[PDB]
Design a protein around this ligand. Structure first.
Ligand code: CLA
Ligand SMILES: CCCCCCCCCCCCCCCC(=O)OC[C@H](COP(=O)(O)OC[C@@H](O)CO)OC(=O)CCCCCCCCCCCCCCC
Ligand SMILES: CCCCCCCCCCCCCCCC(=O)OC[C@H](COP(=O)(O)OC[C@@H](O)CO)OC(=O)CCCCCCCCCCCCCCC
Ligand SMILES: CC1=C(/C=C/C(C)=C\C=C\C(C)=C\C=C\C=C(C)\C=C\C=C(C)/C=C/C2=C(C)C(=O)CCC2(C)C)C(C)(C)CCC1
Ligand SMILES: CC1=C(/C=C/C(C)=C/C=C/C(C)=C/C=C/C=C(C)/C=C/C=C(C)/C=C/C2=C(C)CCCC2(C)C)C(C)(C)CCC1
Ligand code: SF4
Ligand SMILES: [Cl-]
Lengths: 729, 31, 78, 37, 734, 137, 40
């Protein structure tokens, strides 16, 4: 009736479907009745202010609970032995055993151990007291308030931006490149130079004295005189003790490379010069597009000029296509953010920046797994909204014969070749694993097919790793690349050849097989997503798929052949492969590091070449402590993870019910329940307002996928944390 | 040193500001 | 220990014959289709029974006789 | 289940509110609004 | 009575090279790959191939002959490999130190490692079928006897094939012959079951008992007289059993007491072998034979005497059931599916009873102490029974769609059942919900309490107790029965109920299986899963014809959807029932495996103390889900996952093989044909581009087949996983 | 020295210890000994198992190149003859029936002529009989 | 005869015959020349 107000059709639905679909379409503003393009952008703009405020509030909570209930001040005095505390536990359901078990990390009350790495982050950037953490938390509350007010303000009549304002691509790129990226990076370099670096050298710098405490004794005169070399002289010595003046230098900008010997993290002076350098580039990059002064580039002119004889119209009219389609823009943003998020995961574990975090193995595992899963979700979303663009926004006439239109032209070639490579990888990668399993099973492990990852090893050699003896480029002292006199080379070569870190881990046949398994997952997930996007507008089975929508009901009479072919169904299928691919790579990352951390790299090297090795040495072996979190003899600090481990297993299985069964069985079952209610004395008096009905076909798949995904994530998270935490503190 | 009781209570009072503003923004978005 | 059984004697014969007579009388009064199928050479002496009724009552009689003889022997009454 | 942290009485108040009153008020308001008109 | 038609079907190979001949649509040849799948799916759906009941019956009768030939060939193999590729003779001379083996692999690509040392210098795969124990009980002593049995089986297989061909292509019985159910019951009660049990009783008395008595006395197998020597020289029998001196006179004079030396009621188990006394089994089969033969003269065939099954059915009607049982005789004499539905339900239930009774009353010598054989036999026959019961639901639904005529069933029990079907399912729905909450909820309760460090709040023997007092009471009565309610029985029917511990070769054969809180909880889990499985299948039968989706009978037993109305067909309920049957039976066999290892099986010290396989951890661990995960699955899976490089490595391989097939099935269960058809279009384009497109157009699997494929691979993967898990574990504990 | 992390099997201490206990994979009592001698020429890791090099160097052509050539010849043979049979039956009245009931005399003819498939494939490609024009489908 | 010949020419018989023949070649080659991991 009333709810949903944005859909009269849904509001008139007399069944419980009204409630479910009202929630699932709440944020699809484009489909709301009476929605206009100008009001669409303004509503999105205000919603974005809300999301930013939530992020600041979330960050404020992290700071507040650490300062209030954590052990930050105790932790900084012994980072390698004290376990950081996330927040206190107040659970009246706890028994005597649980209270003692969770009274840990030196606390006087039950607490949870933090694995987010915030302790290492806060300490590295110069925070040393609970008061400073408290000040930051309060500051973020005010900052969150400002954006909440801004969202409300820019929804008022006089302050609503015009549609042309939202379409000014050139101005936004200039501002966000130079200002949002460049100035922010420059400002962060300022914090590092004026606060973080002095704190690492035992010098207190805060708001009370930063004005009277020059970051460098030479002042700013060298900067304006061109004598920039002064800021790099006298760097921190290899014997520097982080947080103290012992062995500390005076340089504020360096290019040492490698890791700080004690903290096993990147030099802060290098990080400062890094963020200063990219700030200059970003600021320059932000002057490329013309806004109001004639100079600069027109993006429309650039796109319409890049066309050749092999791609027809080339990039013609793509400025209008992208600028007028929010789904195209969202797809590009998600795809770019997805790639960057994986880059963060890949380069943070190998090139850690936070002091002592390389020795917090559970935190490293949690962070890599966390951001890789986020990357996987972003990549799926990018293709999902790419498919939505084709269904809703793509205009064949405007994009006639351009690169976009030609992608739809050779879609059969694209899909067929993607099918082949997936089959090509799957047949032979699985075959080699099974070959090794059988020969090892028959007591002949010497008959395994063990392929040396020569190409990857060669790349490591080009960066200076001399283990493989390829003697190429940076691994070759006589190479022109090696004799350049680069400042970072001595530090970098030491780090890559130390063998005591995760920088270019040594790889072997085990790494070869799993990397090709990852390639199978990537290509297969892309195949499903790309097929959904390219076939979204129609196929031979359903030539008129475009005029039905991204997701459409396929349970109507005469629509038996319209099921499973919507672009939404491609997303649904791709989610399973995304989770599977992430499972393979996270298993790979964790098992390999377990050997590296414990020094027994031989286990992974020898047992990762057949699947029974993963089953036995990784899954079975590392579950022992987890499943003993609680047992007939008592409980320990892993009891919660053991309970969550079974909880994830249960939620995962519950998803099978929605994924396997179909609506018809449950609709008739509900009818019997409805029959019983209407005939039970004293109960038929109570009458429902919405007629109970079984879940729709699309809804059941979404619900089933939700239980599947939640159980998938929760199960591994408990195993990942408990197995690592149990082994290493 | 550890945070004082007044500091914890003071944070709660400050948190009423984003709470009130969040209510206004949500109501405005509902329109 | 084992239930007592009786070595054959005229007493055993009397019980078996008596049980057979009871089965014949019971069959004559309860069988619905008596003179159906193969007939007897002289049905006058068999109360109209056919071959099937004659064998059926006799078979039932032997079963009753075995149960009675074993039961009475078990209790020592015979 | 006590607490050495400052203002250790706050969880005794906030958690029941976040755990009992907030879901109760939320469910009541949403169900009434969803089942209105 | 006997009436046949001469040479109705010429014998010709012409139709062999014309696949799909049996169906008019398929006989025209393939246009798409769907034709290939339909050919195999509809091959043996005879009633859809011809509308004449007489023709359908003739195909069934000869088809059943073909199945018997297949079974005989399988039996012939078992005896042959026992005769030629086994260590039966070596094992027979030392059963307590040699493990049975009857399969030897060729040494190729290193698979010869599977020929493990089973003792006595023999190398081969250790068998868990219990064939050696059966053969020893049967009196087999040398390979030649097994070889002769193998040859006989092949001859019988040939005879069955000839009979099948003869009774279809030459002399096919008329419909009236098949519908003589009174005669069939008489012959198959008195003739098949009656004489079969009488004949076997004669075998045990004259062959099995004397040979086994000598074997149990320590006589070397080669020194034991051959079976016929006891008949040619009855004095040999008299020495072992003096009552044989009196001959058959006691039998005919009703002086049966003298035969008490070989027709016994000992009960319990043979101390030497740990199996049932063969004298008890002989009296058992003799008594059974008399009962079945008597039962087989009940129905009237040709001589007036006997009951009419139609008359019996029509007479049993009451005030609460209208016409009562009227009309059922017509259904059961005109619908093969109705008969198959009943027979599958009872035969499936019978197989489950076989598993339950055989483990607790081990009939074969040395079976009880071979834990691999005990676990294998129980698990195997549990699965067979479960599948057959699901079949009863399938063919019950098929009957409703195809053969049920409402006009011929007015106000009878079948018609009345369809009227209150909503009441049946609604109430069955509630009890399932009640059982689920109050059975699985207890485990969730215990998991939470133990995790929270509150053991005193759990449901356990050391905590809040749920004692199965009724089961405990029954066990007490059965323990007291010998001498009080079964005065002539010397020992209890099974030591599982109570009493002494039977130990053979230092291992426990059987001992009391005590029941506590953990047993109470799991037993009510079984009630929950069985009730739910019955709900799905019963709902399928009751709603096979009507609703939502009226006139469902028109669509048929197998239809994708109606017009959401997907998964409403009778077939779709079988699809869901299979998952729950798998879920139900998986817990049953897990319950059996853990309980026996924890509380029954183990080593017996010379003093008498028993050390169980898992040290009695069932009581405190089986009350939480974490306990099952940790103490049962994780702990006992160590054997299979560590099997690589040993003779058990094959189970390690199949353990991973099962996990793979289970995962592979999810591709079919979670997806639909629409996506795959579109994918095939792009692939077809590539084949067209190279002029290599097939004439038979590729098609995605039908909606029903996709579900059928998914469940088939799901069950295969899950069952194979457990199979490897059980065999590797049980072969490693003793 | 490339592959410094590896070592010849004949000089790898782990291989030497394990190679003396290689199991016999067939009924030949010396099969395990023969395998020990054969694999001695390969490169081994620390664990003593042979590793294969597929970067293209001809000193390890036997690792992947020679197996690769043999597979492609066999694979192309199978595909080419199957394609030839499929095309030919397409010219008959009932091509579908000849896909489920094979024309064995025709199939054998095609199969025995697959040893020249690389030449036949080149000839068809140049004569426009291998690839169909996009406008033709 | 013609019907039997056609039956032996059916797809399932033919593929099983080819697979059986192919399996025999591979098995027999490995029986005489086992453990070939690479071309010497
Ligand atoms: C372990 C589970 C599993 C496996 C093995 C596969 C395998 C496959 N999927 Mg599937 N999938 C799965 C789960 C799985 N899927 C799940 C849970 C979902 C979610 C619904 C999907 C959804 C999905 C989609 C949407 C797609 C795939 C695709 C693929 C293919 C990927 C390429 C490849 O590996 O080719 C190599 C092939 C294999 C590994 C298959 C197994 C080969 C066996 C081991 C050898 C042959 C055995 C032989 C026939 C004997 C038969 C048995 C007996 C009679 C003798 C392949 C057929 C893609 C595809 O079709 O690409 C072309 C595709 O589009 N899958
Ligand atoms: C190893 C990394 C992963 C590889 C994945 C597989 C890639 C397979 C690419 C096959 C060819 C793609 C179609 C080329 C179609 C074609 O003819 O493109 C031609 C086109 C260049 O032609 P033009 O001069 O017309 O280009 C004008 C431009 O402004 C683009 O419109 O692009 C290329 O040559 C590079 C393509 C890179 C693709 C990456
Ligand atoms: C039993 C009662 C019993 O034997 O009643 C017997 C009664 C049959 O009465 P009649 O005298 O009419 O029976 C004539 C027979 O020859 C059958 O036609 O059954 C009903 O009326 C159905 C009642 C179902 C009531 C719901 C039962 C649900 C299951 C309960 C399980 C408890 C454990
Ligand atoms: C006038 C003027 C000049 C003089 C400037 C002078 C004399 C001082 C300028 C000071 C400035 C511009 C300070 C800016 C500080 C910004 C901050 C502090 C922003 C923080 C933002 C966030 C989001 C923080 C988040 C977090 C918090 C709060 C935590 O506590 C934990 C970490 C993290 C989560 C990151 C010069 C001549 C130079 C140039 C021309 C203009
Ligand atoms: C469907 C669709 C869509 C979507 C899409 C997507 C989702 C995509 C993605 C994509 C991706 C995801 C991509 C990626 C890429 C990457 C790349 C391309 C890279 C490159 C790199 C480089 C080139 C590098 C280089 C280097 C090295 C390696 C070393 C050092 C040095 C240097 C730097 C030189 C859209 C929305 C458009 C719309 C339409 C439709
Ligand atoms: S969803 S087409 Fe598939 S079952 S609705 Fe019928
Ligand atoms: Cl537990």
């Amino acid at each position: 009736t009333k709810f949903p107000k944005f859909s009269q059709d849904l509001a008139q639905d007399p069944t419980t479907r009204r409630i479910w679909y009202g929630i699932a379409t709440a944020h699809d503003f484009e489909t709301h009745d009476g929605m206009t393009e100008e009001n669409l952008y303004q509503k999105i703009f205000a919603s974005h202010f809300g999301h930013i405020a939530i992020i600041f509030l979330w960050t404020s909570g992290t700071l507040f609970h650490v300062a209030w209930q954590g052990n930050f001040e105790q932790w900084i005095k012994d980072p390698l032995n004290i376990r950081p505390i996330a927040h206190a536990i107040w659970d009246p359901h706890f028994g005597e055993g649980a209270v003692n078990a969770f009274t840990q990390a030196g606390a006087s009350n039950p607490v949870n151990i933090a694995y987010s790495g915030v302790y290492h982050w806060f300490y590295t950037i110069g925070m040393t007291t609970n008061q400073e953490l408290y000040s930051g938390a309060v500051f973020l509350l005010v900052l969150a308030s400002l954006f909440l007010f801004a969202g409300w303000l820019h929804l008022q009549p006089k302050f609503r931006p015009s549609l042309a304002w939202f379409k000014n691509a050139e101005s936004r790129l200039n501002h966000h490149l130079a200002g949002l990226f460049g100035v922010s990076s420059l400002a962060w370099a300022g914090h590092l130079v004026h606060v973080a670096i002095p704190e690492a050298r035992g010098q207190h710098v805060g708001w009370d004295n930063f004005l009277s405490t020059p970051p460098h004794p030479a002042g700013l005169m060298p900067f304006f005189t061109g004598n920039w070399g002064v800021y790099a002289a006298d760097p921190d010595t290899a014997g520097h003790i982080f947080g103290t003046s012992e062995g500390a230098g005076t340089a504020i900008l360096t290019f040492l490379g490698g890791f700080h010997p004690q903290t096993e993290s990147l030099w802060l002076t290098d990080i400062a010069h890094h963020h200063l350098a990219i700030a200059v580039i970003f600021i320059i990059a932000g002057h490329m597009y013309r806004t109001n002064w004639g100079i600069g580039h027109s993006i429309k002119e650039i796109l319409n000029a890049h066309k050749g004889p092999l791609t027809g119209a080339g990039h013609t009219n793509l400025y209008d296509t992208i600028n007028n389609s929010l789904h195209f823009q969202l797809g590009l943003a998600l795809a770019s953010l997805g790639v960057i998020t994986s880059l963060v995961a890949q380069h943070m574990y190998s090139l850690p920046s936070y002091a002592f975090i390389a020795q917090d193995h559970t935190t490293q595992a949690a962070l890599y797994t966390h951001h890789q899963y986020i990357a996987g979700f972003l990549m799926v979303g990018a293709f999902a909204h790419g498919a939505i663009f084709f269904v809703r926004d793509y205009d064949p006439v405007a994009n006639k014969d351009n690169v976009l239109a030609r992608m739809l032209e050779h879609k059969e070639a694209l899909i067929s070749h993607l099918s082949w490579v997936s089959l090509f990888l799957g047949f032979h990668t699985l075959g080699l694993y099974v070959h090794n399993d059988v020969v090892v099973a028959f007591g002949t492990p010497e008959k395994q097919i063990l392929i040396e990852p020569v190409f990857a090893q060669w790349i490591q050699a080009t960066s200076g790793k001399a283990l493989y003896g390829f003697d190429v480029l940076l691994s070759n002292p006589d190479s022109i690349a090696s004799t350049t006199g680069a400042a970072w080379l001595p530090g970098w070569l030491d780090a890559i050849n130390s063998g005591t870190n995760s920088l270019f881990l040594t790889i072997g046949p085990g790494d070869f097989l799993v990397h090709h398994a990852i390639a199978l997952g990537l290509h297969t997930t892309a195949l499903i997503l790309i097929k959904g996007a390219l076939d979204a507008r129609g196929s031979k089975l359903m030539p008129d798929k475009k005029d039905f929508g991204y997701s459409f009901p396929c349970d109507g009479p005469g629509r038996g052949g319209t099921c499973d072919i919507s672009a939404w169904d491609a997303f649904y299928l791709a989610m399973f492969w995304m989770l599977n691919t992430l499972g393979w790579l996270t298993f790979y990352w964790h098992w390999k590091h377990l050997g590296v951390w414990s020094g027994n790299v031989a286990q992974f090297n020898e047992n990762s070449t057949y699947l029974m090795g993963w089953f036995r040495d990784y899954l079975w072996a590392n579950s022992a402590q987890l499943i003993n979190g609680y047992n007939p003899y008592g409980v320990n600090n892993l009891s919660v993870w053991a309970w969550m481990f079974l909880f994830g297993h249960l939620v995962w299985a519950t998803g099978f019910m929605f994924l396997i069964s179909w609506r018809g069985y449950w609709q008739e079952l509900i009818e019997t329940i409805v029959w019983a209610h209407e005939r039970t004395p004293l109960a038929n008096l109570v009458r429902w307002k919405d007629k109970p009905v079984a879940l729709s076909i699309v809804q059941a798949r979404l619900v089933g996928l939700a239980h599947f995904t939640v159980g998938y994530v929760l199960t591994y998270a408990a195993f990942l944390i408990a197995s690592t935490a149990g082994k290493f503190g | 040193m550890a945070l004082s009781d007044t500091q914890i209570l003071a944070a709660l009072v400050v948190a009423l500001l984003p709470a009130f503003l969040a209510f206004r923004l949500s109501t405005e978005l509902y329109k | 220990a084992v239930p007592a059984t009786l070595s054959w004697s005229p007493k055993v014969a009397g019980v078996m014959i008596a049980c057979n007579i009871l089965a014949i009388a019971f069959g004559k009064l309860t069988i619905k289709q008596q003179n159906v199928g193969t007939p007897m050479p002289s049905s006058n002496f068999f109360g109209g029974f056919g071959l099937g009724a004659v064998l059926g009552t006799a078979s039932f009689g032997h079963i009753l006789g075995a149960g009675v003889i074993l039961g009475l022997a078990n209790m020592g009454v015979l | 289940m006590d607490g050495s942290y400052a203002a250790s009485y706050l969880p005794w108040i906030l958690i029941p509110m976040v755990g009992w009153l907030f879901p109760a008020v939320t469910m009541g308001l949403l169900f009434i609004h969803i089942e209105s008109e | 009575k006997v009436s046949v038609d001469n040479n109705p079907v010429p014998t010709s190979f012409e139709k062999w090279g014309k696949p799909g001949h049996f169906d008019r649509t398929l006989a025209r040849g393939p246009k798409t790959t769907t034709w290939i799948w339909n050919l195999h799916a509809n091959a043996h759906d005879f009633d859809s191939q011809t509308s004449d009941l007489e023709d359908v019956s003739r195909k069934i009768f000869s088809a059943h002959f073909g199945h018997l030939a297949v079974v005989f060939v399988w039996l012939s193999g078992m005896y042959f490999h026992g005769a030629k590729f086994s260590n039966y003779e070596g094992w027979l001379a030392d059963p307590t130190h040699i493990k049975p083996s009857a399969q030897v692999v060729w040494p190729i690509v290193g698979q010869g490692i599977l020929n493990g040392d089973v003792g006595g210098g023999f190398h081969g795969i250790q068998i868990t079928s219990g064939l050696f124990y059966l053969w020893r009980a049967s009196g087999f002593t040398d390979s030649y006897q097994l070889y002769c049995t193998a040859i006989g089986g092949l001859v019988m297989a040939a005879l069955m094939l000839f009979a099948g061909w003869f009774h279809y292509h030459v002399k096919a019985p008329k419909l009236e012959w098949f519908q003589n159910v009174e005669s069939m019951m008489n012959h198959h009660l008195a003739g098949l079951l009656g004489l079969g049990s009488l004949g076997w009783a004669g075998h045990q008395i004259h062959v099995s008992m004397p040979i086994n008595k000598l074997l149990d006395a320590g006589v070397a197998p080669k020194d034991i007289p051959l079976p016929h020597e006891f008949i040619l020289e009855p004095s040999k029998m008299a020495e072992l059993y003096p009552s044989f001196a009196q001959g058959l006179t006691p039998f005919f004079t009703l002086n049966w007491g003298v035969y008490s030396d070989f027709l016994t009621f000992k009960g319990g188990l043979n101390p030497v072998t740990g199996g049932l006394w063969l004298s008890d089994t002989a009296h058992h089969h003799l008594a059974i034979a008399v009962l079945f033969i008597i039962a087989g003269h009940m129905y009237r065939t040709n001589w007036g005497i006997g009951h009419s099954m139609k008359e019996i059915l029509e007479a049993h009607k009451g005030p609460f059931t209208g016409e009562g049982h009227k009309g059922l005789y017509e259904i059961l004499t005109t619908s093969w599916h109705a008969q198959l539905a009943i027979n599958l339900a009872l035969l499936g239930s019978l197989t489950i009873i076989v598993a339950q009774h055989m483990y607790a009353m081990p009939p074969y010598p040395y079976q009880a102490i071979d834990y691999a054989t005990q676990l294998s036999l129980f698990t195997h026959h549990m699965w067979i029974g479960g599948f057959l019961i699901v079949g009863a639901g399938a063919h019950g639904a098929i009957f409703m769609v195809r053969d049920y005529d409402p006009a011929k069933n007015v106000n009878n029990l079948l018609d009345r059942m369809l009227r209150h079907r909503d009441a049946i399912i609604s109430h069955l729905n509630w009890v399932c919900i009640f059982l689920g909450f109050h059975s699985f909820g207890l485990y969730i309760h215990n998991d939470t309490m133990r995790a929270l460090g509150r053991p005193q709040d759990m449901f356990s023997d050391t905590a809040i107790q749920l004692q199965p007092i009724f089961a405990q009471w029954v066990q007490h009565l059965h323990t007291l029965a010998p001498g009080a309610t079964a005065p002539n029985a010397l020992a209890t029917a099974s030591y599982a109920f109570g009493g002494e511990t039977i130990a053979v070769a230092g291992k426990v054969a059987m001992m009391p299986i005590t029941l506590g809180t953990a047993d109470f909880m799991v037993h009510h889990i079984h009630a929950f899963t069985i009730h739910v499985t019955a709900l799905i299948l019963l709902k399928g039968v009751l709603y096979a014809r009507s609703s939502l989706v009226p006139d469902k009978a028109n669509l048929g037993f197998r239809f994708p959807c109606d017009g959401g109305t997907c998964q409403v067909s009778g077939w779709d309920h079988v699809f869901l029932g299979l998952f729950w049957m798998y879920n139900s039976l998986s817990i049953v066999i897990f319950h059996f495996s853990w309980k026996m290892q924890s509380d029954v099986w183990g080593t017996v010290s010379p003093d008498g103390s028993v050390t169980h396989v898992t040290l009695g951890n069932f009581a405190q661990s089986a009350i939480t889900i974490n306990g099952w995960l940790r103490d049962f699955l994780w702990a006992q899976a160590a054997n299979v996952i560590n099997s690589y490089g040993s003779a058990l490595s094959a189970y390690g391989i199949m353990f991973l093989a099962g996990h793979f097939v289970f995962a592979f099935s999810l591709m079919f269960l979670f997806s639909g044909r629409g996506y795959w058809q579109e994918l095939i279009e792009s692939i077809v384009w590539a084949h067209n581009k190279l002029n290599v497109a097939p004439a038979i157009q590729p098609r995605a699997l039908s909606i029903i087949q996709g579900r059928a494929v998914g469940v088939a691979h799901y069950l295969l993967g899950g069952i194979v996983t457990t199979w490897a898990f059980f065999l590797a574990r049980s072969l490693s504990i003793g | 020295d490339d592959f410094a992390n590896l070592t010849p099997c004949s000089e790898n201490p782990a291989y030497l210890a394990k190679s003396k206990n290689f199991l016999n994979t067939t009924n030949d009592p010396n099969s395990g000994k023969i395998r020990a001698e054969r694999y001695a020429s390969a490169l081994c890791g620390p664990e003593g198992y042979p590793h294969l090099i597929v970067d293209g160097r001809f000193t390890h052509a036997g690792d992947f190149l020679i197996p690769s050539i043999l597979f492609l010849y066999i694979a192309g043979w199978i595909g080419w003859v199957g394609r030839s049979y499929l095309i030919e039956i397409r010219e008959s009245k009932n091509p579908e029936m000849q896909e489920v009931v094979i024309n064995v005399p025709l199939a054998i003819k095609k199969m025995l002529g697959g040893f020249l498939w690389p030449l036949a494939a080149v000839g068809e490609y140049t004569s426009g009989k291998l690839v169909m024009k996009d406008s033709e489908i | 005869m013609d019907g039997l010949k056609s039956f032996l020419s059916t797809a399932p018989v033919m593929i099983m015959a080819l697979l059986t023949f192919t399996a025999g070649i591979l098995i027999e080659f490995n029986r005489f020349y086992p453990d070939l991991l690479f071309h010497p």
